[PDB]
């Protein structure tokens, strides 16, 4: 089984420097030519390059946007591809994902699930998780909500489970809002049986690693 | 660099019908690859060298075209497909993808599940009071949400928050949050969320007053 996963995507201020890495397993690493595109929040995907395999030595290509700023290189010994970003810039927000080329500049057959880089002058921010319960059970409805409410953290992402995974059916996390002050704020509710209220436990687990923080907040 | 156009950008089908999508290239290309991106998750590969279907991809999609015409076809369409699909070239330098085409699916309408929830105590010790209602399992999305503060219609001091259509039942969900200072909040009592959508005979309101929960 072919598995991309990246790492390294964070807070970086403009004009700054960021490495990327992506470990990759289950292929022979050196036989396969790999790239890097990145996604802008709600744009398109923009290929950004690639480094070929052992026969080329490590031959790169870039596109005119990164050329002289993005490096591209690969290290063997660990399966591991990097991208060096210099110079960033606000444009250079994105998603960046690896991808693997089934061939020579034929076409991504496999992708990492991609890490976030943010290029901000502003600052690191944990959030705090606030619980979303109702004034009262209501014996009349059958089925009532609870929710964790993750807000103003700087910057994205934000991961919520429930019960540590174990809770899974009827959880909605929203996407998060840009609050006015420049810090977002988002909702993970989940729906259960009134029938349950009082009975067992709902807790929030909501990891923020960009500020190391983890929070497991009780909502009943 | 060869610009790839998709059309159309936005498509919204029943179950079993079909979704037909084109990419036309600027210039002539060998071949045009079709990824598909599910909410939350990274692109994967759906059709390659024009009509080849990734292993594991359902016989429900199709690929065709030749030059400067391409088209991606799905003959049945199903929830699982909800999903952004691009089509891609590597026939010059460099390779780009088309804008991107937004699939939704068209289900029955069904009403939303209301609730509405107050600030809590440790955020209220703070200095600030967010206010919570939630729009559950609704189909259409457009949904009208508006917040009454002792009957008084509030505009400007609330942000609303839409999740991506679900494969499993076909509908939306809505977060809209009310935040006010605490002593603004403390000067009040009725706080309540007024909701207007297609599954609703008539707006319903779920509320609550403060000082009461």
């Known amino acids: 089984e072919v598995q991309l996963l990246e790492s390294g995507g964070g807070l970086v201020q403009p004009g700054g420097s960021l490495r990327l890495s992506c470990a990759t397993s289950?292929?022979?690493?050196?036989?396969?030519?790999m790239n890097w595109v990145r996604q802008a929040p709600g744009k398109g995907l923009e290929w950004l390059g690639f480094?070929?395999?052992?026969?080329?030595?490590?031959?790169?290509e870039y596109s005119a946007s990164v050329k002289g700023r993005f490096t591209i290189s690969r290290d063997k010994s660990k399966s591991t591809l990097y991208l060096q970003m210099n110079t960033l810039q606000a444009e250079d927000s994105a998603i960046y994902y690896c991808?693997?080329?089934?061939?020579?500049?034929?076409?991504?057959?496999?992708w990492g699930q991609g890490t976030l880089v943010t290029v901000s002058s502003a600052s690191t921010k944990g959030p705090s998780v606030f619980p979303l319960a109702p004034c009262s059970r209501s014996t009349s409805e059958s089925t009532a909500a609870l929710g964790c409410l993750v807000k103003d953290y700087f910057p994205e992402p934000v991961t919520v489970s429930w019960n540590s995974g174990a809770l899974t059916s009827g959880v909605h996390t929203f996407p998060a809002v840009l609050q006015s002050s420049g810090l977002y704020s988002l909702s993970s509710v989940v729906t259960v049986p009134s029938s349950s209220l009082g009975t067992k436990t709902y807790t929030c687990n909501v990891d923020h690693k960009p500020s190391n923080t983890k929070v497991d907040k009780r909502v009943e | 660099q060869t610009v790839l156009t998709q059309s159309p950008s936005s498509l919204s089908v029943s179950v079993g019908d079909r979704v037909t999508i084109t990419c036309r290239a600027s210039?002539?290309?060998?071949?045009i690859h079709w990824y598909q991106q599910k909410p939350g998750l990274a692109p994967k590969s759906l059709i390659y060298?024009?009509?080849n279907l990734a292993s594991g991809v359902p016989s429900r999609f199709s690929g065709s075209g030749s030059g400067t015409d391409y088209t991606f076809t799905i003959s049945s369409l199903q929830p699982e497909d909800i999903a952004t699909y691009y089509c891609?070239?590597?026939?010059?330098?460099?390779?780009?993808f088309g804008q991107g085409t937004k699939v939704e699916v068209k289900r029955t309408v069904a009403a939303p599940s209301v609730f509405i929830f107050p600030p809590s105590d440790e955020q209220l010790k703070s200095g600030t009071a967010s206010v919570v209602c939630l729009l559950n399992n609704f189909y259409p999305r457009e949904a009208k949400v508006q917040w009454k503060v002792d009957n008084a219609l509030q505009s400007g001091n609330s942000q609303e928050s839409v999740t991506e259509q679900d494969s499993k039942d076909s509908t939306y969900s809505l977060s809209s949050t009310l935040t006010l200072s605490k002593a603004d909040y403390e000067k009040h009592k009725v706080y309540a969320c007024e909701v207007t959508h297609q599954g609703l005979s008539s707006p319903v309101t779920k509320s609550f007053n403060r000082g009461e929960c």
């Open positions: 060298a024009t009509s």
């Open positions: 891609q070239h590597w026939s010059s330098k460099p390779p780009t």
């Open positions: 289950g292929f022979t690493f050196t036989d396969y030519y």
């Open positions: 480094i070929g395999n052992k026969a080329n030595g490590y031959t790169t």
């Open positions: 210039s002539s290309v060998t071949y």
């Open positions: 991808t693997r080329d089934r061939g020579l500049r034929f076409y991504f057959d496999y």
